[PDB]
Assembly symmetry: C3
């Protein structure tokens, strides 16, 4: 395990996701409100899935070698397995907060699936120049998602409770900033142009992942917006 310099960040990531999972699990024990239960379920599952995939990367299972540029390049494929399930759960948290219509939710989840799926294909593609074609398609799917979060959701939040409108606005802003960093790190890291070494890349993704999951969850689950308006 320690044979890879990036192991320290995989281990820290595993620990922080594990701790985040346990914290949300305990916190949600005292919850009976049916609406709050939905948000706790979604939000606890996110770091639990990430915990398993960080562990698989730490132990070496979630790593494969991909030939491109005349080299055997270490590619952590387990990231995409994580993201396939956790990024639509994160979007679902946002969509339920603002009572999004079903068509909009399906558009978001579908675009998200395309985003992660094409990122996976790009990560595993052996023809170097083609990796960036997949990156571009994935990034276009991301831009669609960000567009919807701003010009379909923000003006939906404003007709809702003030506490859900303010909580949505904060989580929207956190999401757009954090999620936009992922394609940049991929592009300059070992999957793309290879300018930033894998150990630093792994650190960067770990900070983004913990912030986008445990950070996000801490903000959401401390808000009164997750509860039905009750006396």
């Amino acid at each position: 395990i320690t044979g890879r310099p990036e192991w320290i960040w995989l281990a820290l990531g595993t620990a922080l996701m594990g701790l985040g999972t346990l914290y949300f699990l305990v916190k949600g024990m005292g919850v009976s409100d049916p609406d709050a239960k939905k948000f706790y379920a979604i939000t606890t599952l996110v770091p639990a899935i990430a915990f398993t995939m960080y562990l698989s990367m730490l132990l070496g299972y979630g790593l494969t070698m991909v030939p491109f540029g005349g080299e055997q390049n270490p590619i952590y494929w387990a990231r995409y397995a994580d993201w396939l399930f956790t990024t639509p759960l994160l979007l679902l948290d946002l969509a339920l907060l603002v009572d999004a219509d079903q068509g909009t939710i399906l558009a978001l989840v579908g675009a998200d699936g395309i985003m992660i799926g094409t990122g996976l294909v790009g990560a595993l593609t052996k023809v170097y120049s083609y990796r960036f074609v997949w990156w571009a398609i994935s990034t276009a799917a991301m831009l669609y998602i960000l567009y919807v979060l701003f010009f379909g959701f923000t003006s939906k939040a404003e007709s809702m409770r003030p506490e859900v409108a303010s909580t949505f606005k904060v989580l929207r802003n956190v999401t757009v900033v954090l999620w936009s960093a992922y394609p940049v790190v991929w592009l300059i890291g070992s999957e793309g142009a290879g300018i930033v070494p894998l150990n630093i890349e792994t650190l960067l993704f770990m900070v983004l992942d913990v912030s986008a999951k445990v950070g996000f969850g801490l903000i959401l689950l401390r808000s009164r917006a997750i509860f039905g308006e009750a006396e």
Copy 2:
């Protein structure tokens, strides 16, 4: 890319799915009705997914070699990845049109999953005679789906709005004819008996795919059946 004679049909397929995706995306921009949004979301996602998988076939990612009959046989596995997601979306379009009950929808999607999954296993099976066992099981799942579309849905459409009944009937008929061709092409093509060469097989699937997705979508999204009855 041009090293494979079937590349021209993969390229045309990619282009037509891409163009179809953009057309539906633009067309649905001016839509606020919650019901119509569902149909636009579902129907736009279908060629978008197909676009990505056609591209993966064009670039060579979605192709593998399978030993059977003492030969290395080129198998485009990306078709099944496409179909796994797009065929239940197509069925969902039909089921929502007639306000199908939840049990019926689950039966359809489940049978569809079995249909595509067993087709994939058959496509990748190395014992030649066993490929046709999987083809038979998949075809039985197809026949179940077609049965339900006729003797569970058609008489559901007739108690609904005339515009939804007439639109459903047309899309049902398009679906049954087009979908029934797929097992025949598989059986006589490079996956099955090998009587029709891969380049012609690829052409045939491209015509079926564009018709079943973009053709289907053009009929559906031009109907007033996708809108709630409103003043």
Copy 3:
């Protein structure tokens, strides 16, 4: 096929799932009640999926070799493909019976996904001692599911119809006993410590699978709890 001593149990399993599938399919033909249709759909799909995966194991497709302990160890990976889809369907049968809230259903299905997914990783892991780390995480996800079935569902059933409360209690008890045997068989069988040989392991899983699917389904589909209260 007969080259593997466990083939007889794979063949019997295939037959019993096939027969169970046909029986439930015929039985549900005379059903119009929308609630009952849901239970028939879910419950018929379960042995149908299991039939396909038992067949893939019989024909040899669903088997791979995994190096650990200095040996090539036969691992039937198709079990996890089965279980990935059938165990959440089984939980859905239980959850719908007691009209579980959406948050609880998502927690169950999510924990179940983690349970099966980590079992799959453990089954395919090449470092022997690490296989048991994945077994432990999977078992913890199982224990969560069993906890919810007892201390979240049982007291939900009691405020419902007596026929649904009594049917739920029986199916809950069947589920907890049968499902708890699976991690034990894995641990002592060819995936784990290797004390029980593969042919006996295969027998054990076949008895558990038929009981947990066809047995379970026979109890559920003969109950009046699956019908809406109607005059």
